[PDB]
Design a protein around this ligand. Structure first.
Ligand SMILES: *[C@@H]1O[C@H](CO)[C@@H](O)[C@H](O)[C@H]1NC(C)=O
Lengths: 191, 189
């Protein structure tokens, strides 16, 4: 079996706790959490094996040492989070971006450009396209959330399908919070 | 009007290896994971925690540890055989950290999702040949009571390179395999 004691801390970009939960699970079943309104360790929702969680309400709830820290609750996060918190809402790395042809997929068009976009934090990022200065739609419409790299950097891409004419200049626009200025990358058929 | 953020302190335990762990993660990237041999918080890469293992709260941790371990200890056998054990089969994919430029130094990321229970060993193979990878394997706790993990292989891309990432799920020696080949290489400048 596996068991969890999950504490979530929810605080806005400044550093104030808007909510906080203390849940207890066993075998990927959510068993007992903290109810701030009634100030108790009540079992979460209902359950087929909740009786264990109901008994899990009695062991605990017999511990004022604990039972106080749950009353403390929200502010305990700010107390726990204040040292690093600033820098983490402050942590921000701009996204290197590059444009190159990729193998065309799902298209009658002969050329497909990928605008790769990597090494950034946070992951919120927006990528659009332009042809000769004006704004066109991108290839997919399904919103791809960026893929975590596991080392606090993220990455992603957008595609664009065109029939080439050398007079044209296609441009890819990246709006990370990392930069104050939109990053552009031009592409021309004779590049 | 201000965007919200989640810092999750996840205390976990299980039968087998490891017996106990503790991942804390801000925004689904972890900064810390605990060490119970050394009673200290080991850092991921957020410039390696200048604040680090502030000992400012062992009461919280050491309490959750013993209780978790009680649930595995005294609740385990009473329920063993009566309700089924929750398990997923882990999913592995490998992509490049940076864009693919032939002959230019890169890294291979092996992203393991759907890890439950969190016990695994990951091996890299280059043309089906066992090859050591940079760093250790980072297991992180994620929302919804599951786990993920990362591994990394530095290398220089050749047009012919074939790599594979192999995940062993330690609960019954199950394996997932994920292949990599160079695709859509950007022009070398
Ligand atoms: C931020 O989080 C709180 C709950 O913690 C929620 O009530 C509030 O609506 C959220 N703010 C926004 C802008 O969604």
């Amino acid at each position: 079996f596996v068991a969890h004691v999950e504490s979530t801390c929810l605080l806005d970009d400044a550093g104030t706790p808007k909510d906080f939960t203390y849940c207890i699970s066993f075998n990927k079943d959510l068993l007992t959490c903290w109810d701030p309104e009634e100030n108790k360790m009540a079992p979460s929702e209902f359950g087929v094996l909740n009786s264990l969680a109901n008994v899990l309400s009695q062991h605990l709830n017999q511990k004022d040492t604990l039972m106080q820290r749950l009353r403390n609750g929200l502010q305990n996060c700010a107390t726990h989070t204040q040292p690093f918190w600033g820098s983490l809402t402050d942590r921000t790395r701009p996204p290197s971006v590059q444009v190159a042809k990729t193998t065309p997929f799902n298209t009658r068009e002969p050329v497909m450009l990928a605008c790769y976009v990597w090494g950034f934090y946070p992951a919120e990022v927006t990528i659009t396209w332009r042809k000769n200065g004006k704004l066109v739609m991108p290839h997919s419409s399904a919103h791809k959330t960026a893929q975590p790299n596991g080392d606090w950097t993220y990455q992603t891409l957008s595609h664009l399908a065109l029939t080439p004419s050398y007079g044209d200049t296609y441009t890819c626009v990246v709006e990370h919070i990392g930069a104050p200025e939109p990053i552009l990358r031009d592409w021309t058929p004779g590049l | 009007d201000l965007q919200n953020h989640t810092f999750l302190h996840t205390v976990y335990c299980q039968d087998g290896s490891p017996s106990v762990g503790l991942s804390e993660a801000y925004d689904e990237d972890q900064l810390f994971f605990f060490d119970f041999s050394q009673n200290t918080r080991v850092p991921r890469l957020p410039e390696f925690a200048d604040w680090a293992q502030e000992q400012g709260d062992a009461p919280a941790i050491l309490f959750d540890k013993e209780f978790c371990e009680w649930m595995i200890q005294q609740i385990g056998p009473k329920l063993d055989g009566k309700i089924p054990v929750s398990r997923g089969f882990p999913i592995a994919e490998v992509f490049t950290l940076k864009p693919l430029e032939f002959g230019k130094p890169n890294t291979l990321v092996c992203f393991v999702s759907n890890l439950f229970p969190p016990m695994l060993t990951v091996n890299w193979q280059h043309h089906s040949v066992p090859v050591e990878g940079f760093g250790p394997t980072f297991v992180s706790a994620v929302d919804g009571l599951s786990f993920q993990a990362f591994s990394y292989l530095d290398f220089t891309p050749e047009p012919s390179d074939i790599f594979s990432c192999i995940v062993t799920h330690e609960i019954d020696r199950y394996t997932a395999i994920a292949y990599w080949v160079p695709r859509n290489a950007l022009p070398s400048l």
